[PDB]
RNA sequence: ACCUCGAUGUCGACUCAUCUCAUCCUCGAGCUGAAGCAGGUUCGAAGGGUUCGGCUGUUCGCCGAUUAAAGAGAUACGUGAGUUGGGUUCAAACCGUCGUGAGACAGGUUGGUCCCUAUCUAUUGUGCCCGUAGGAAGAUUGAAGAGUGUUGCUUCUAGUACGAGAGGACCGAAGCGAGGACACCUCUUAUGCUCCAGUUGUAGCGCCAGCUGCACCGCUGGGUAGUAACGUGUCUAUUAGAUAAACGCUGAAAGCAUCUAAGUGUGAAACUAUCUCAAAGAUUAAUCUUCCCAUUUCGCAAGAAAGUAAGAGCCGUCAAAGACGAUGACGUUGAUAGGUUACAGGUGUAAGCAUAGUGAUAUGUUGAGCUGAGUAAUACUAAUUGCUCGAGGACU
RNA sequence: AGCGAAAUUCCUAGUCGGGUAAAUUCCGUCCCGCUUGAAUGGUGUAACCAUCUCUUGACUGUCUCGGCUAUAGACUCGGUG
RNA sequence: CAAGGAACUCUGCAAAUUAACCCCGUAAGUUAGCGAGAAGGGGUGCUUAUGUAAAAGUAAGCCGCAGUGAAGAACGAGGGG
């Protein structure tokens, strides 16, 4: 498909009212206003994608191989650059909008990197069951258990490559789709949306059109107190 | 949990090849000589514009 | 490329009321719910007070408590919940901006309240 | 286990940074771990800046955290700080303390930095 | 939390006072029965002089849940107490006289005549 | 009657389970002595799932109530360098029996002790070195991989067709969904060990007042940020191809015909794609452009002194990451962390004063005071007035 | 004589009944009763038992359902080793 | 640690709950010795008066959600051998 596509950054999450009165969660980003910087195709580069860049610096924040190019690409210095597959109808040199890529109430879904909290436990990496607290314990309680798959020569006597071994959970690629547009703001080019949100304030918000309901799309509305005092 | 057979000399060797220290950086004093470790003082008993100690 | 996170605030400034009088969990009020059986709203009242105010900024969620046919019931509403109306009835006394002793303590008495 | 050292407890920690934030009023200069004295000297901006409002409600929120030595009797040091450090340093924007990393410990690497005050 | 025998109160002229939850009927693993959820009880106490036994395996429904619910408009429903009444398989309640009020989140599924004789609806 | 006693750990329960179909169901299909429904048989079929309790050591077994079923088998009836020792097989003590007695009971009975500091490999994450034929940068790519390949109820269809009456559809659509996978602390709950308020006494702070230490963090009640669930939010269809069983057309043999041998479609949750995560040491080290250099001169232009000029590393402010490593931002050109200012939240009328009472006390001052972590500016403090390496294109 | 399916009885989940959605647990019934049985003492009794032991009001983070905090470890750095 | 409160376990194993004082109140069997702390409930702060010699003890007021607010102090009932 042609996927549409921006970069934004969660910068909080919070509630809002609806009208038809249902609660409805906020998680609010901000999205940067993107100067693409190019275009490649399946036919001619072999991928079809579009390069884009944002975080604008000046030109003494950038390593002079990308910011060589940047200027040989007639682009003012920006921090990152990244494409996005499937899109091709933004073309470089033109300012993104969120009122073009998608529309009020219509279905998406967001590419992030979850937030940085280290190793966690196999009970929570794997979600296992932890041993016995009464009837006595011992030092050793959580764990999955055995890792035998059968004794004797020739039965297991390993554990094979692959196994789903504690290590680093979080901060990691993730995404859900599906997830109402709640809100537009054009002026500021912010976007309001529900659910909860991978990552920290900061984390990368890439928005692209949701697999699941692709152009699905669901009417609602703000919810303005007009009860006079 | 307990070892069957001793640990051969090379792979040991091998093992601790890998082994290295930290690396540690350099600086000069200000208003004195002896080099000293980047972000420490130098046996000058002086950081650089400065002499609020003594040298003992 | 510098952010304020403070006009979150300002995007917040939408969803709120201007009518609600200062309360400090323990003035008795009595919110009006709007509430429909298919159309025709009708309204349901319900008297009582803050038990806990709990939330940050549009988030201040607080609890209002009242008993009717020996059953209490303990319901968080919103500030500026839509259909949501509170009439603030009498002012108590503040020991503290919240209370955990409200199910410990019983009806039948006058509970104090400011002159 | 059971019984031992108890290490690095919360009023342990409290205590010691205390005994610290006295000292340093008591000679001017402290020689300790730069873990220590990075979290010393937030707390010691704090004291500047109670100092700096000077009232007989900061002489009593003061005296809470102070603690006596020899020489330096609680009376005369709180009342000398008031009198003349207190609006000595009263043109700056924080920043009122500095760590100089020294020489490590003799024995067992303890990382032996300066805290002392600044403008 | 919904589990097995779950004391809870009886909201009907009925004349027992504890009954506990033999059976979720229903979805497996589900363990949770909410506002409405029809459930398979045994009755732990009953006097002969009301009109329901003990030990029995019946049908009951829970009216109240004392650490309470998030309701789709955003305001926290909640209680001080789980109770529950006895139902005869139908939208009609065993117990005539409904003890305390009810709530809105299982008139979709029926029930309409204890709610008719509920005190208040809200 | 054996590989294995200079020993070769077996019962259950737990945790994790994985693998296979002669598959229990979700699925598709034929037949039926299958009106419909209920179905049964058989064929394909592992994509997924297949309960809770009580008694009994219990894998054996009994009972009750459920969902779609509450499948089986294997892994030493998987597995104690993972847990218990319920049990099995410990002395001991006892009942009954036997043995004259030592003692035994393939009888019961009471309780009956699980050590291991990981060397290697097998594995999960994290790093360092080198390399990929100048360096480095990203944007990649996708070969190979994985997760994901669950499902039920109600209503409309529809009491419709059918059937006869009764009984009662096949498919689809809408809602509700249960489970688990992922994320979060905005709704709710706990924690919140340098947050606040109050309180008990002791030791004190020379006393009143007020302050501190200790006392299950002294206790009690909360609580900023944060942590997490008991909480929220998405998810189960789908597409393309080939499908199994199975349904096919035509058609030869067997002049007719016949799903197959030719030509030739439809059709399962099975398979490969679409969905998602990483991925060139993938030595098949793949592509692209980019920026810098190719720096007169002395043995191969051999380091000959100018050894990137792209920059990187060391080190540091650090958390953005976070056992360390490392990732990432930032190094005076900076807001990189801290502090200051003010704000938000929490917390709750600070001290003290006036007031009346002898005093506890209460009214005003006062929503005042405080605040680890939240919010915006502040070069105020600390990232030095620092160091090292880093290309000449290796070989046609 | 007496006791009893007695912890003594393979049949035992003995037949029946009680507590029992559920209960080889437990207590009541009868005595062919592998292998009951009166100084191996028998039958009961009043109290008591760190005795066995059935059920239970609270009772609980045992389980549901795992989680928050804190030190000390683990881990890093250093000395010893 | 909200919330179910024994469902986990062969079995309530551990923990949990109670805890000083006084005020009431306490059953069956029984050898009259016991049960019994049976079981079951209330509360204690400060100031004023009354208070006796200190007391206890009571009343009036005042407040806390709470008053041996730190400490150490009792869970119980029925069944069987």
């Not at chain 1, 994608?49 to 990308?66: G, H, I, R």
């Not at chain 3, 319900?46 to 008993?67: A, D, H, Y």
């Not at chain 4, 920690?13 to 934030?21: C, G, L, N, S």
């Not at chain 4, 220590?36 to 809470?64: E, G, P, S």
Request: net charge positive; proline share 3%; hydrophobic share 35%.
């Amino acid at each position: 498909m042609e996927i549409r596509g921006i970069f934004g950054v969660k910068v909080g999450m919070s509630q809002v009212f609806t009208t038809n009165n249902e609660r409805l969660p906020i998680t609010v980003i901000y999205c940067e206003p993107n100067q693409v910087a190019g275009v490649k195709t399946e036919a001619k580069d072999k991928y079809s994608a579009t390069l884009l860049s944002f975080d604008t610096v000046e030109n003494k924040k950038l390593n002079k191989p990308q910011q060589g190019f940047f200027e040989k690409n007639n682009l003012k210095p920006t921090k990152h650059l990244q494409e996005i597959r499937n899109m091709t109808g933004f073309e470089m040199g033109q300012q993104i909008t969120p009122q073009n890529l998608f529309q009020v109430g219509e279905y998406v879904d967001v590419s992030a990197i979850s937030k940085g909290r280290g190793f966690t436990g196999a009970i929570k990496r794997w979600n296992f069951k932890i041993g016995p607290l009464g009837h006595g314990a011992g030092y050793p309680h959580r764990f999955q258990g055995s890792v035998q798959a059968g004794r004797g020569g020739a039965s297991a006597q390993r554990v094979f490559k692959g196994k789903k071994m504690s290590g680093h959970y979080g901060h990691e690629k993730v995404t859900v789709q599906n997830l109402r547009i709640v809100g537009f703001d054009e002026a500021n080019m912010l976007v309001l949306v529900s659910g909860a949100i991978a990552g920290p304030e900061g984390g990368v918000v890439l928005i692209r059109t949701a697999k699941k309901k692709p152009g699905v799309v669901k009417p609602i509305e703000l919810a303005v107190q007009t009860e006079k005092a | 949990a307990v070892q069957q057979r001793r640990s051969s000399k090379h792979r040991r060797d091998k093992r601790r090849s890998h082994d290295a220290l930290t690396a540690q950086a350099l600086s000069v004093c200000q208003k004195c000589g002896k080099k000293k470790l980047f972000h420490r003082v130098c046996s000058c008993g002086m950081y650089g514009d400065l002499r609020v100690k003594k040298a003992y | 490329k510098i952010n304020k996170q403070a006009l979150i605030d300002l995007v917040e400034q939408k969803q709120l009321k201007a009518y609600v009088p200062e309360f400090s969990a323990g003035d008795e009020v009595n919110v009006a719910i709007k509430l429909k059986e298919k159309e025709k709203v009708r309204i349901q009242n319900f008297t009582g007070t803050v038990l806990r105010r709990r939330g940050k900024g549009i988030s201040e969620t607080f609890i209002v408590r009242k008993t009717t046919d020996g059953i209490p019931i303990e319901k968080n509403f919103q500030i500026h919940n839509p259909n949501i109306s509170i009439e603030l009835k009498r002012r108590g006394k503040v020991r503290r901006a919240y209370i955990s002793y409200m199910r410990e303590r019983s009806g039948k008495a006058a509970k104090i309240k400011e002159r | 286990s059971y019984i031992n050292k108890p290490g690095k407890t919360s009023a342990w920690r409290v205590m010691t940074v205390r005994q610290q934030v006295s000292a340093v009023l008591a000679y001017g200069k402290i020689e300790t771990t730069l873990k220590k004295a990075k979290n010393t000297q937030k707390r010691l901006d704090k004291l500047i800046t109670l100092a700096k409002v000077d009232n007989f409600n900061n002489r009593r929120q003061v005296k809470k955290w102070l603690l006596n030595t020899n020489l330096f009797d609680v009376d005369q040091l709180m009342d000398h700080l008031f009198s003349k450090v207190a609006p000595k340093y009263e043109k700056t924007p924080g920043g009122y303390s500095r760590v100089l990393k020294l020489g490590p410990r003799r024995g067992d690497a303890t990382e032996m930095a300066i805290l002392q005050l600044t403008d | 939390m919904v589990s097995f025998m779950t004391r809870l109160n009886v909201a009907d002229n009925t004349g027992a006072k504890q009954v506990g939850i033999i059976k979720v009927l229903g979805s497996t693993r589900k363990r949770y029965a909410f506002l409405g959820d029809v459930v398979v009880v045994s009755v732990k106490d009953a006097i002969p002089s009301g009109m329901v036994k003990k030990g029995q395996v019946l049908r009951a429904v829970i009216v109240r849940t004392k650490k309470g619910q998030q309701r789709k408009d955003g305001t926290h429903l909640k209680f001080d107490d789980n109770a529950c009444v006895l139902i005869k398989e139908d939208k009609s309640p065993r117990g005539t006289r409904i003890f305390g009020p009810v709530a809105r989140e299982l008139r979709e599924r029926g029930y309409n005549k204890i709610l008719s004789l509920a005190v208040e609806v809200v």
